[PDB]
Design a protein around this ligand. Sequence first.
Ligand code: CL
Ligand code: FE2
Length: 483
Amino acid sequence: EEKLYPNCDATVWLRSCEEEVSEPLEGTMTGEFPSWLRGTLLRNGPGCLNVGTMRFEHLFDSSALLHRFAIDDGTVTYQCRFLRTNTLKKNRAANRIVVTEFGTKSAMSDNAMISVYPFGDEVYAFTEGPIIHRVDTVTLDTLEQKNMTDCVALVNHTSHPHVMPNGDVYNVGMSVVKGRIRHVVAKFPFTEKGDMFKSAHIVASMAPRWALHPAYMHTFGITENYFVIVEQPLSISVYGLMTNLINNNKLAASLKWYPEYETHIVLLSRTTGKEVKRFRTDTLFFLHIINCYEHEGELVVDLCTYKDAKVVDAMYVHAIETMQSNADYAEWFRAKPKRLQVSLNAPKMTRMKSSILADIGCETPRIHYDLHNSKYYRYFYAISSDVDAENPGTVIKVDTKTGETKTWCRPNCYPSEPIFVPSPNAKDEDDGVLLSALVWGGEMNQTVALLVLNAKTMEEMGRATFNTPSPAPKCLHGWFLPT
Ligand SMILES: [Cl-]
Ligand SMILES: [Fe+2]
């Protein structure tokens, strides 16, 4: 009758928005918002498990729900609107699940629920299939879609492209070249006058370790001189995926875990586009690389690591529903931030040094991205990933130099991925604020807030709180657009 994880309400993930907030909701302000903070926080995430009388069976299948916090002069409004995807249209028309999903068989999907990223002045919602959807940054209307297979011959891609200071976008994905799978880096070059998608081209590539079992990757790294590919022993079975698509099996069965093999860190030259170096580390699974950089002949790769890929199994609806009696659930979610380090001049297949960055589980990490991505940095921000923590909704700041942590948490409160915004006359790396979207657990399922933390102290500066007309689903990733 009793809970193994009494301080954790996993059912914050199991909500369906029943009514869109199309018109801006006025927010109840507490504390003191920074007056200088002006712009739009966009969020994306799962937002509907229901499809007529049917129900999705995995969280990754849940319908993409966009969120908008408009911030100006200490006032904040809230909106949320479903992304108008092909999958949503087809499922709603049929009033049932007619598209095969990651975790659900139909009775490829374009449910771009993972993230939102800027391509110049435009913003696109992503999943890892090749179709992305443009989003109106004011109204959350779904505008045109783009097909990355048509655009640059990507059959799939990560939902976490890298955005350069000059506006250029890089992303990694799979491409079939002369009947063979290759991992490729696509570049979407920014110019005011041009079209980033029209001028998109492949700038690097890499052969998979196993020709018909290419490695899955959710993120990739970039340094001054290299694209960094972390090739983990979780693979997509080409024939498996084809089979499941034909026979209408959930596509998750396409993933294969091979723990007898190690993880490789592969550097592709930004100059030549070819693999130039490769190193080894332990068998691990990862989703989010924190940052990569070169410093005085050393390569640094910071990422949030698991021992295996069981976190995927943890996010089945049934697994979430029954987690309070699951003795292994916390271990499935057991992530640890690690620094992988090696000399750039070291021989090929040298083992990397692997160090823990902090003695606390971290996920959905962010940094002072605009100034520190691909470069030396000191601080990252994340959310606690320990299911069995005293408070599993902790916002964490890690000082990578010292190992010092600073935290913010409140009872029954579940903050999102924190996004860093620098202060107007910023001197230091952590001279700014964190924006986080809050939901609450238990029966407090129709309240959302924008939290603003002081990045130096991790103290709450201010908060805007909203009530939604229907259940408020928990989001995944976002982006801040300054005015
Ligand atoms: Cl607390
Ligand atoms: Fe992600």
